[PDB]
């Protein structure tokens, strides 16, 4: 079968199937293997995952090596990220503003690539942000990624994770990449606080609270620029949120973000914590 790769430990599951660590038996590099049994309903959203991944080429987006078929099982092969999710990294305790800024810059760099490639991720949460063992920050899970073309200037599909969802996308309004800017603002909050606004509530309640309420804000002992960065991303009017490129030159990013190698530290804090139970 797809025996260029040997499975290692199971490293995750989502809706679609499950993720494994693996090795390409031709280069001995560590890889990440999404496995999906194609026996049933979500298959069009499986196709779109691989079709986008194939078309992405950036050090801020999880690479793609190909898909295979063993009987019914589909094997999507992609870049392995040993630091794992930014979400898991939050668990031990709060982050500092440099760590927050640094991770955001790398998301911002990632979103900029996608949005310049006419692609909206449509699911930015700290969970889908993965870190390489050396601290490189990359976006993952393109299961719900949408494609803008020269014709389809906007999308309409109701998709994403409720808490990180933009008013316009919840409301089925015609939306574009700016939706990801909103999510990134919620992701900014998440990183700063460990939880997105409303996370105590049931997702359905949330789906009426996002559109009805005004945008969430970042309350607490965070510096003005951070608060303003969030304030800037979280705008009810899509067009008044800034673009990723623009947010890359925002003050908070620029004064706090340092080398992404200093994130080996955050990855360590998790290891020490995770091994302690």
Contact indicator for 122, 144 with CB cutoff of 8 Å: yes
DSSP for 75-126 reads EEEEE--TTEEHHHHHTTSPPPHHHHHHHHHHHHHHHHHHHHTTEE-----G
List beta partners, residue 255.
Answer: none
Question: Residue 223 and residue 231: Cα distance in Å, rounded?
Answer: 12
Nearest C-alpha neighbor of 135 from the set 244, 12, 269: 269
Kindly tell me the burial class for residue 12, based on how many C-beta atoms sit within 10 Å of its own C-beta (0-12, 13-18, 19 or more).
Answer: middle
Query: Which CATH number do you get for residue 10?
Result: 3.30.200.20
Indicate the resolution in Å. Answer: 2.7
Say how far apart CA 188 and CA 193 lie, in whole Å: 9
Same domain as 217, residue 98: yes
Last residue of a domain, one of 55, 80, 105: 80
Looking at 59, 80, 101, which one is the last position of a domain? 80
Q: Are residues 53 and 127 in the same domain?
A: no
CA dist., res. 134 & res. 266, Å (int): 10
Phi, psi of 65 (to 5 degrees): -110, -20
**Can you give the residue range of the structural domain that contains 14?**
1-80
- How many domains does the structure of the chain reveal? 2
Same domain membership, residue 151 and residue 62: no
140 shares its domain with 100: yes
What is the C-alpha separation between 234 and 236, in angstroms, rounded? Answer: 7
The answer to whether 186 and 198 are in contact (CB under 8 A) is: no
| Residues 12, 203, 141, 92, Cα dihedral to 10° | -50
Strand partners, 33: 20, 77
> Same domain, yes or no, for 201 and 182?
yes
Q: Which two tokens stand for residue 275?
A: 């091994």
- Beta bridge partner(s), residue 102: none
- Annotated binding-site residues read 11-19, 34, 79-81, 128, 141
Task: List b or e across 143-175, with b for residues whose CB sees 16 or more CB atoms inside 10 angstroms.
Answer: bbbbebeeeeebbeeebbbbbbbbbbbbeeeeb
Within 13 Å, how many C-alpha atoms sit on residue 194's CB side?
10
Half-sphere exposure (CA, 13 Å, Cβ side) for 68?
14
Helix residue ranges per DSSP H, 118-177: 167-170
Measured in residues, the chain has a length of 277
Q: In terms of domains, do 165 and 269 share one?
A: yes
How many C-beta atoms surround the C-beta of residue 87 within 10 A? 18
- What are the φ/ψ torsions at residue 81 (nearest 5 degrees)? -130, 95
Q: Which of 71, 96, 112, 123 is catalytic?
A: 123
Concerning whether 57 is annotated as a catalytic residue, the answer is: no
- H or E element at residue 274: helix 264-274
Grouping H, G, I as helix, E, B as strand and the rest as coil, residue 11 is: strand
Q: Which two tokens stand for residue 99?
A: 């760590």
Collapsing DSSP to helix, strand or coil, 237 comes out as coil
Instruction: Decide if 5 contacts 24 (C-beta within 8 A).
Output: yes
Q: Which residues are annotated as a binding site for Mg(2+)?
A: 128, 141
Buried b (16+ CB within 10 A) or exposed e, 230-262: bbbbbbeebeebbbbeebbebebbeebbeebee
| Residues flagged as binding site for ATP | 11-19, 34, 79-81
């Amino acid at each position: 079968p797809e025996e260029l790769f040997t499975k290692l430990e199971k490293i995750g599951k989502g809706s679609f199937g499950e993720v494994f660590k693996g090795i390409d038996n031709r280069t001995q590099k560590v890889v990440a293997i999404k496995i999906i049994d194609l026996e049933e309903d979500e298959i069009e959203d499986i196709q779109q995952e691989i079709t986008v991944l194939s078309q992405c080429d950036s050090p801020y987006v999880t690479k793609y090596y190909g898909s295979y078929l063993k009987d019914t099982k589909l094997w999507i092969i992609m870049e392995y990220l040993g630091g794992g999710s930014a979400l898991d990294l939050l668990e031990p305790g709060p982050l500092d503003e440099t760590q927050i800024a640094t991770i955001l810059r790398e998301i911002l760099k990632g979103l900029d690539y996608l949005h310049s490639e006419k692609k909206i991720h449509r699911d930015i949460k700290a969970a889908n942000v993965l870190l390489s063992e050396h601290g490189e920050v990359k976006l993952a899970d393109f299961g719900v990624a949408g494609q803008l073309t020269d014709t389809q200037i906007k999308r309409n599909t109701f998709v994403g994770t409720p808490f990180w969802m933009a008013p316009e996308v919840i409301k089925q309004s015609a939306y574009d990449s700016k939706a990801d800017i909103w999510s990134l603002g919620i992701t900014a909050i998440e990183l700063a606080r460990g939880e997105p606004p409303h996370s105590e509530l049931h997702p359905m309640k949330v789906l009426f609270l996002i559109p009805k309420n005004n945008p969430p804000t970042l309350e607490g002992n965070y510096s003005k620029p951070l608060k303003e960065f969030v304030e800037a991303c979280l705008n009810k009017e899509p067009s008044f949120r800034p673009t990723a490129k623009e947010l890359l030159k925002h003050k908070f990013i620029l004064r706090n973000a340092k080398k992404t190698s200093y994130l080996t530290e955050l990855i360590d804090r998790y290891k020490r914590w995770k091994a302690e139970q």
